[model samples]
Target chain A: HMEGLKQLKDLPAETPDGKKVMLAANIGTPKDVASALANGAEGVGLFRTEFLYMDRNSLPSEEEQFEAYKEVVEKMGGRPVTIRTLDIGGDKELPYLDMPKEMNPFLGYRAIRLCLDRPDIFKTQLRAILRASAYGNVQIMYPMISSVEEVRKANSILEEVKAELDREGVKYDKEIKVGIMVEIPSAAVTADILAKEVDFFSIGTNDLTQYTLAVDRMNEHVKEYYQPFHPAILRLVKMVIDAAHKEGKFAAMCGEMAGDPLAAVILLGLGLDEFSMSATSIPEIKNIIRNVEYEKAKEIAEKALNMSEAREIEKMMKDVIKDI
Target chain B: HMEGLKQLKDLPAETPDGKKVMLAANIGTPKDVASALANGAEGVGLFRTEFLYMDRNSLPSEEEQFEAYKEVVEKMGGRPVTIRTLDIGGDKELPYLDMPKEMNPFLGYRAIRLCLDRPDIFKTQLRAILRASAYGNVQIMYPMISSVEEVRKANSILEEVKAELDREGVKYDKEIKVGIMVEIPSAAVTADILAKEVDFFSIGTNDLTQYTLAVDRMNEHVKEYYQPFHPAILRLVKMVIDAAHKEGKFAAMCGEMAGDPLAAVILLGLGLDEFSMSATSIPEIKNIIRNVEYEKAKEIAEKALNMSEAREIEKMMKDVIKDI
Candidate 1:
């Protein structure tokens, strides 16, 4: 337990300029989640609720979930903390979930699918997050929402939980921000419609780049072709940013590309509003920002949009930002 | 003129594998030198005579010297070719040899001293190497010496010439090798007792190391402070090699160490050798070869003598001879 607390404390916290950088801290025990929040993470991006569920070999009671979430919220001190509901599938082999073996599990029933099927687990996690909202600024975000119907179905469950909490007279943050990660290309392209449905958009560029390019980053043979500077990716980003803007909603980018100096310039040129990167990379990004003027970034964007080929765009950017 | 020819082509005709590494070449003009050796050089280890003396104002003629020496060698071959034999002091400087405001002119009479003295007025530059040598192997090695006595003196002259060459010789190899660079150290140390008297002793590490150490080749740097590995001046290799072999004969070393992959290992362990470095090394010598082997070399001779330092001795020998 002591070791767990030390591990949580060891996680990277804020950037040099004091901006929150990490989304999660791999604490060994559930109780250490509260400690990680105290250390400077903006929110829990991935709450391994399986730990609580698996340790008992049975679903955690609503009271147990409430207590844990309450501790996490209190530790956050009113900072917006995002809670991803129970998303289990893909070789996790939860004994109670009893998921069958599939040929392509990643494309199969997972995340909200499994949760919706087992309302018991869904209700438990949703009730816990809603109950915790009473304590501080907390938001609920769904993961692996492949289609608009999935998001709509998930939202319906959230509405049901809110109704139950209301009937029980449990006060909660009624205006809690609800958003979904734009990981799939379909979701990113339809983000304008999703924007109307949700409060904000968080573009997970890693998955988007992988899906858009059809090149896996881990596959060494195709890794060289996995370019973040592709015109399609740029177009996708511009589309999402413009969509969010049209709906008067905020958008953020969180991925390895967000930290890269070259890609950061391109994304900023595309009008990306927020960048979530590793703590160490923030100083480098800030340094680049200080050196380059916003007007120059806009010029680079104009040039990039006019170019059809990714390589041509990259070469042009290189010439413009040679000093950078 | 005679001395210059010997310096440029004095290397052993064959490699250890019985391949001829030395080629007959001349450098009377920088331009011709550049064209002759079209390929990039290792460096110019030797720049010949006649050109240095012949081309210039009232003297043998500075313009003729520059044009002749610059082209012949640089044009014929692109490699760095060392030039030597401007030892003409008495009737050499002629009208230009007029003694300036100096105390002892003989001590500072001619050769490198004379050239270094009036650098501004010193006709015939020491710079402007075959730029092609940079593409191949080319290094400039200084010659005509009797001790540490003329090493620094000669370098100062080359320095002046180099400055002028840098300004004038646009197509010349910039990186060149410079060293006191001759085998006369033995003759100087033993009061001129040694039979071998000339440029650096290009033959046999056994003789050089033994002569320098005064001990048999077997004795390492430990038993005596004067050990070849004693860290004093391994550059005095020509003296030591010449001293041990007192046959009054000029011995040449085309051994495995001359072309060893571990340059510094052989360089410090065996001390200096008449380097027949390839044309590719001509321009890179000064930068590539200096001080790289100093520290580790200090321990080479010391350990070679001590049965205790035998492991270090083995390591150094292995490093040099491994490729062979």
Candidate 2:
């Protein structure tokens, strides 16, 4: 159905650094999975499982959850797939759950934090994802991580899930890649400490941009200040990537900025190992990456880093990559 | 009625840094103002103006806003009073204003920002405050400023109001002080630039703690992560004060954190020129400050800054100043 994706499939995926520049999609459905693979994607970086639980009066059964996870996990063809489980945390509009109208929803309870709260709800989803992991390259990542303690705490719960699975004689990937989203600044600042604990790291730019600038990207009034290409944001991105590599682990960007052709160049220059975005935008990002050499990107990054103003960095990004 | 405040009336009002630490009440009525002064409050630091507009069907008339401002200004008995303008910006329960339900309310539009947009609304309040300036030693501050441009824009609007007042032959303090709350990190990071545009700086630790740590104090789940005594918050406080002093302007703190006796030590050590806390809590803070030496506080601040964790800083502030 996606002609752009079909055309992108005909090109090579090699990058300037002799690296196999991988494309992953933050997809919600199997159809989106097909669209991603067609657009030169090697895997699914963030298969958000929140959609299945929404619009229902009751929680999805383990089998129902397994079907959704299995469908996407099976479709990925055994490549790297990192699925975020039940990220139904604060601020989402779900009428089914008796959620208190939070005064501040975005920073409240949800995601891995909520999962760890109710073991019954958390383990059911974990068991489904683990059962589905047997079908394909499936990894679990927790969103909105604020500290190393949260990472260790979330991992402990995963161990509980694994112990339960073993007692039942059920099969799941024991080496299922575990990760956390470096969206919060606290997590971003402590990425080095967190890196030593996880299998990989995925930077969620939407929240990182939102939290760092203290500007809501959705607020029509203040979105002008929520520039994703700001100098501070670039530094944070560079910080996470550097922390990831320092620990011999690869870092992937699953935020929408990963799909931006211009941002892709700077991130590539910053040595971001994985790029996951909307499947529709993948071809364009790859087109930009296909022309950019890593050394050239690094040069641009160094120059941009020296500049203080976000507007200046944005202009630098636009001008430096205008020709590319 | 406040026995604690009356009891604290007996202490001297001097911080360890030789800076006259003044206590202020976030007062609503004339009685509240008296309660503040009776407890030995030298001035009112944050006289919130939003109370007049709330619980009403429409915006308060300029005369009504002026009267309320005048009452507070007159009651402070010629002591320095800083009134924060109608801060009905983020998540305010005002039906007349038509604020969109923001996904992240704290980061949304409010404060001088909302005033900048609706010049008619922001100016009406500004004009009234200026009129009230004729009554006593009153200064104005804008809260939740995120950028240097906001300072310039808000000041430009104030200038327009001043010119209009001059043409009307109004009696007001032309040299009335103007300042910004260094609550947002962008403002904190660029305080030096912002400092040049304003007469003073008021470091609001509540929002700063929320934004820096990416934890919402209102959210019960992540409230534990909302460490007001965090190193980042202390460093930001120190940075803003240092920036303000460099520009030859005084820096004050008007957040709830200013009320904490433990934080009072680090803030004192960091050379906060003014401390605007609860009037009741002021006497106890004065008791602590009376026994402490400026040199000792500076050493405590130096040690606290070197420490990484907020809990460590919290412990250090407690242990080091327990008997002081």
Candidate 3:
């Protein structure tokens, strides 16, 4: 479509260290997959599967899940897809699930917690994801993981589901890479320990920023305090990525932040392996990625980590990016 | 009077290292001061001044605050009293202040943050505390300090007030100890750096616990995740204490956890210089403090810090305290 978009794919653009920083898109359905491919997205970064389960009277049956998942998998055309396990209890209220009203929904029963409480719901989605793996490359990621035990418990359930699927002779991918969204500070702090279990990591900056700063990202009153690029958030990002690499696994970012060209540089320097964003933004981000030097990104990241204030870090980032 | 309550005043209870772990209490008015004294509290740790600010049509005049603050100071009769500056605005809204409703008030503008923005409100209280310092020992504490810059700025304002009083030939205690409430995780994590700017450190475990664990401590929905005895919380406590000691400053704790005989042991072992709690809990806490060897508390704290999980730490503390 555009001159640079095609060249991004042809140029083999990568960081100075020979790492190809891949671009993935956040999508929910098969049509978006086509849209993503149209925009030249390399893979599907985040597949928010809970959308398929919401607004209905009951949980989507395994058959319905398989069809929806399979369609997206087939449409991806073999590119890697990451489907976040059911995360229904936060702002995404499922009326059929009938969760209790909380003073603070973000901190309440949601994500892996809700799914863990209801294995039938968790397994149904896990099964669908595993089944979709048969059609395309799929990676499973659990959301809102705060502890290593949550990961081990979730993997245990996944293991049990695989045995059952095997007993029933259901077709699936055996090596579906398991991962987690390092959205909570505890998870980021204990990431090295969590790294031992998960196959990969996809950082959810939105929640991580919210919890780290103690500012509700959605709350307008303290939105001024929700500094996503604050040195604290940057430190956590470096921590998780460092821990992920130490365990011989890769880490991806799938929040709206990943789509940000400005953050794209800082993250690039942080040595992130993948940058998953909205499908439409892939072309522009790819263009930026192709043009920028990975060594420079690492320099910016180093400078950012040394700073104390968020405002100063942001200003420093803009100054560096402008020169580049 | 309790047997231990009488003896708490009679004998000097020193830790194994010979550091006197003094007991203090949370009190409001002059009557509560007398009650605290009768309960054998060595001093007043937290004298919450919000009660003087709330439910009024307008801000309390300086003379009104002076009387209230002065009465408590006189009641304490030369014992050290720490009065936290105005901590209203969040859930404890002051309608006359005409503050806007917030999506998430806890993380919104409140406590020391409110005082800094509205210096007139903050200064009025500072004046009262300073004026009352002439009557008795008064230490000033600012609530919810998340940064060293905040402490420096507030201290500058305090310095300015002293200059204003000097010009007016007013007599007040100008050399009062200025400290901060280490409630936010950022403050706890950076206490070593922040310690340079303050006279002392008081760890508010309730808010510290909430921020560190990323759980709404008050929200019943996620209460189970509220790990007060969490290894994470302990490590932060240890870190803050270690930071305070390294900076040649004293660290005290004024949260409910400080009163818990179990937490008191760990805190003592971690080298806390002061214990502040509700007046009623002083005798029992004092008894626990007097009986337990500080070296044993330090040993328990060392083990607690190494534990992987909060549940295990809780069990370990309970087991350790049951024997003590």
Candidate 4:
């Protein structure tokens, strides 16, 4: 099995029917890129930039932010690097940042909400991200987006940063791509409205499952209820992907679900353009994708989507993949 | 203005275009039905049976539970009473009942989950509810139903109780209707499938809004983010209401949003069959409903659903009903 996975690692993740999909890895810092490439990751799907803002007092300057972002993209060669802007607030918090004491931080003022509220912080990061875009394939994606107004607001700020960069005669990618995380159910529901506003969509299933089911994954008592394969979640994923396709845009999944071999088949069948997971998960997911025909995966996805319960779908996928 | 509302109380909640919808009150106990009747409520939209199990109780006996349920229905004088069974856990807890300490109680083992786990507790409540169904027009609704499997599981238990009653030769409403709350996002997304399982759909906006937006309503810091007029929320409401209609089932809303005059217009236009709110809000919502044309409300709801921002929708509705 190890030898088979190693051999498949160097091969493209294409289905038997000749359908191809990108297999990427989610990284928090520049250091994780080595393992990602070693596992044959196509790109950096989610470079969680929050790590730079965390574990320190005060904030990272544009120079510091640019260096970290640039390092990851540079290391990934020319592979697409989707960096999610500061997503602090839920469980992740910065000691120096005077964050509000929230009752439920997951749904509170965090991510794009925090960045939008404090432009000084938002602009500093945007400037660094824009500056880093000059290095390699770098894409900007906003986190915790619930409405289109947020996309426009964040984009408006991005344009402002672009103007500042031009005035200063700073070099950066002029037409760098932009997108939003479709983690919030609202964003998922109105993906059509939001699709036109962004370059692409990356479905964040961790928060999507938590928010959709109203079950905190960390909450052990109800952890069993936090199912990503739940019909509601599958339906939302379908909606987001279809909406993106309708607008002629790519849809990617950087959530933990994208890494699982079972979810990989369904996601591949559902026409997911990219699968970004942990570095080690790349080999197995790629192996699963290579072995299955896209047509068969599509049938599996359709079947799973119609199923009423998550457990039933999970069991079905488990049964379907027993031979693979 | 008070007298104008008083005069309209006796009038049916009908739009100028002749669309009639039920204006009902959410009652916690039998005594609250008096206020509901006084406010000219068409029926008891939500008869929260959890109150009987809470506050100094190991569990309310079947006889004790039956008395309380029967009193409310008998007082309604044949008005349709939607009694939601045993919605406990979360914020509302029973001192006598043993519940696991959950990280997020709102999304934890509560309501139907608890009832299903403790069958003796669930069977007693179902027996009481079934016994009371014979007294008046009573509909049984399950709460926190995330999947159709939960509905089937609960119904199976209910069926067992019904068989016991049949063996005992006890009389009850043989044709009593059964429904599930479209509170969880999973239920909302698969409302079409769930609609076939139950008799009607009651959109519980409090939890729906909370879960859909991933914001806790009680959390003060993010309370503003808990928007009911959000496009995602409005879309879900539309889906639930439309799904109910497609299956020839009536859709009712038993959340605080139903009470708001602005929401009433949109809900009415959305073809909602029932508006269940606080007793005191019945007259005001009825007044708004009586004054506006259902056709115009539909246009407004359509426009609101298309609009991207919640604040924008709220402002537009406030202006639309300013003259009313």
Best-fitting candidate, scored by TM-score: 4
Residue A290 displacement in candidate 1 (angstroms): 4.1
lDDT of 1 by residue, B96-117 (tens): 5564322212222445444545
Fnat for each predicted structure, in order: 0.00, 0.56, 0.32, 0.76
Task: Give the clash total for candidate 4.
Answer: 0
- Give lDDT tens digits, candidate 1, residues A1-324: 112333444443233333323343323234765555454345444344556666456678888888887776787676566666775664475666677554223334567667777787788789888988999877777765544556778888889989998999998899988887665555564565577887766676775665454333554433444566666567667878888889988676666666667775666666676665554455455455545556667677877876545667678766655676
Query: Could you list the CA RMSD of all candidates, in the order they appear?
Result: 28.1, 4.5, 3.2, 2.4
The TM-score obtained by model 4 is 0.94
Q: Please, what are the lDDT tens digits per residue for candidate 4 over residues A70-166?
A: 8888988899999899888745657777777664667677888888888999999999999999989999999998888889999999999999999
Pitting candidate 1 against candidate 2, the one with the higher TM-score is 2
Task: Name the lDDT value of residue B227 in candidate 4.
Answer: 80
Best by DockQ: 4
DockQ, every prediction:
0.00, 0.38, 0.43, 0.64
Off by over 4 Å in 1: A1-56, A216-222, A305-324, B1-324
Per lDDT, the best of the predicted structures is: 4
Docking class of 2: acceptable
Clashing pairs in 2: A89-A110, B89-B110
Task: Determine which window of 10 residues in candidate 3 chain B has minimal summed lDDT.
Answer: B1-10
Candidate 1's docking class is incorrect
TM-score of 3: 0.90
**Model 4: runs farther than 4 Å from truth?**
A1-3, A90-93, B1-3, B90-93
Instruction: Give the distance in Å from residue A298's predicted Cα in candidate 2 to where it truly belongs.
Output: 4.0
lDDT (10s digit) by residue, model 2, range A1-324:
123445667665556566556777889866688888777678898888877887777888999989888988887888877888677765666665666567667767777667777677878888888999889889998888776667777788788989989999999998898998888766776676678888888999998888877888788887777877666577778878999999999899999999987687788878889999998788888777777777888788788777656777777778866777
Per-residue CA lDDT of model 2 for B285-320, tens digit only, reads: 777776688788888889988875677778888886
lDDT (10s digit) by residue, model 4, range B1-324: 223756877999887779999999999988898889989999999988867876775778888889999898899999999999888885566778878766467777888888888898899999998999889999999999888878999999999999999999998899999998889998999999899889998999998998888777887766667788888999999999999999999999998899998888899889999999999999888888888888899898889988877889999999988967
